[PDB]
Design a protein around this ligand. Structure first.
Ligand SMILES: Cc1ccc(NC(=O)NCCCN(C[C@H]2O[C@@H](n3cnc4c(N)ncnc43)[C@H](O)[C@@H]2O)C(C)C)cc1
Length: 332
């Protein structure tokens, strides 16, 4: 006994055995099926029109699947007529992408318990993943095809995949040091590509790698990245310090988005702090997403750092000008 869902673009059908597997306490294949149908119906209005359940009854679930499959066949017949078929070159909506990543994770991370010891993957937010927060980041931070993107410490790769699905960066990378998450990343990658093809959706190029971002090789790679995401909230002093030294080699207009700032928000340059990272970057607290919950109980905010050496330039200009020099020397 089994259930099948046809792909809206003619990829091979999704096939689930009956009884439908359970993935964890809040996820199972029955609701994966229901949500797939719901999202294919958002992809294709005509299907939504044609569509109007006991998830423990094989007959109830077979009837839903049959109704979806017959509607997909009719839509495919419609597209052989004069109706234009669904555009094949598009990015997924945030809602669809959320479903896709959950589906990819369901099928990739076989034993969620093996991951526990590499926690936290989302230390900045109580009770949810970074997904909704990253979806905001992505809309605030303009990225283009000149950009290279990296998630430093990428886990099973979920944030890299989300950004690659939504943006035009030339390449997206994840780097992950631990064996278990890195190995799950390899499956996440194959599953993601499979499911994105199944929905008829495109993503930018990406690569998930094994490695330590504090290594010597990564030194020059960080220097040549234009957009770095790093979830550093729970990092200690020495790692944050080591990262600051890597960032000091980034090019002007390079950006770092993090869960804890790497410099104070109102850094004031003076003769004792001249070599601190604050001398070369604007730092701002981004708008928090309403509804998200931080450790304080308030909405979570991320931190945007933009490499901008005009701050340092202006300090040196001011040291050359006796009036400006006396003012500076006055305060401090
Ligand atoms: C705003 C903002 C939001 C989200 C994100 N991205 C994000 O959440 N990605 C998911 C993984 C989170 N990672 C933990 C993983 O890092 C590895 N890791 C730790 N140190 C590492 C290292 N030195 N080298 C490679 N991997 C490392 C650990 O083994 C662990 O698998 C963070 C918490 C570090 C970025 C920016």
């Amino acid at each position: 006994l089994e259930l099948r869902l046809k792909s809206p673009v003619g990829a091979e059908p999704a096939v689930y055995p009956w009884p439908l597997p359970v993935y964890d306490k809040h996820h199972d294949a029955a609701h994966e099926i229901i949500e797939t149908i719901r999202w294919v119906c958002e992809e294709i209005p005509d299907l939504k029109l044609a569509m109007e359940y006991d998830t423990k009854s094989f007959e109830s679930m077979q009837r839903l699947c049959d109704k979806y499959n017959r509607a997909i066949d009719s839509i495919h017949q419609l597209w052989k007529g004069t109706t234009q078929p669904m555009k094949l070159n598009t990015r997924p909506s945030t809602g669809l992408l959320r479903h896709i990543l959950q589906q990819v994770y369901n099928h990739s991370v076989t034993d969620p318990e093996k991951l526990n010891n590499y926690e936290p993957f989302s230390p900045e937010v109580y009770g949810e993943t970074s997904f909704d927060l990253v979806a905001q980041m992505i809309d605030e931070i303009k990225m283009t095809d000149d950009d290279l993107f990296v998630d430093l410490g990428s886990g099973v790769g979920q944030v890299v995949l989300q950004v690659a699905a939504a943006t035009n960066c030339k390449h997206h990378y994840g780097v992950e040091k631990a064996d278990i998450p890195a190995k799950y990343a390899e499956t996440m990658d194959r599953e993601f590509r499979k499911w994105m093809k199944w929905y008829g959706k495109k993503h930018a190029e990406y690569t998930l790698e094994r490695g330590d971002f504090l290594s010597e090789e990564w030194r020059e790679r960080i220097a040549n990245t234009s957009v770095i995401f790093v979830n550093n909230f729970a990092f200690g002093p020495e790692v944050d310090h080591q990262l600051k030294e890597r960032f000091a080699n980034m090019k002007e207009g390079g950006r770092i988005v993090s869960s804890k700032p790497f410099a104070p928000l109102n850094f004031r340059i003076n003769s004792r702090n001249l070599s601190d990272i604050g001398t070369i970057m604007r730092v701002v607290e981004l708008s928090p997403l309403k509804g998200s919950v931080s450790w304080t109980g308030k909405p979570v905010s991320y931190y945007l750092h933009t490499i901008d050496r005009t701050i340092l330039e202006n300090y040196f200009s001011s040291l050359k000008n006796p009036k400006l020099r006396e003012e500076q020397e006055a305060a401090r």
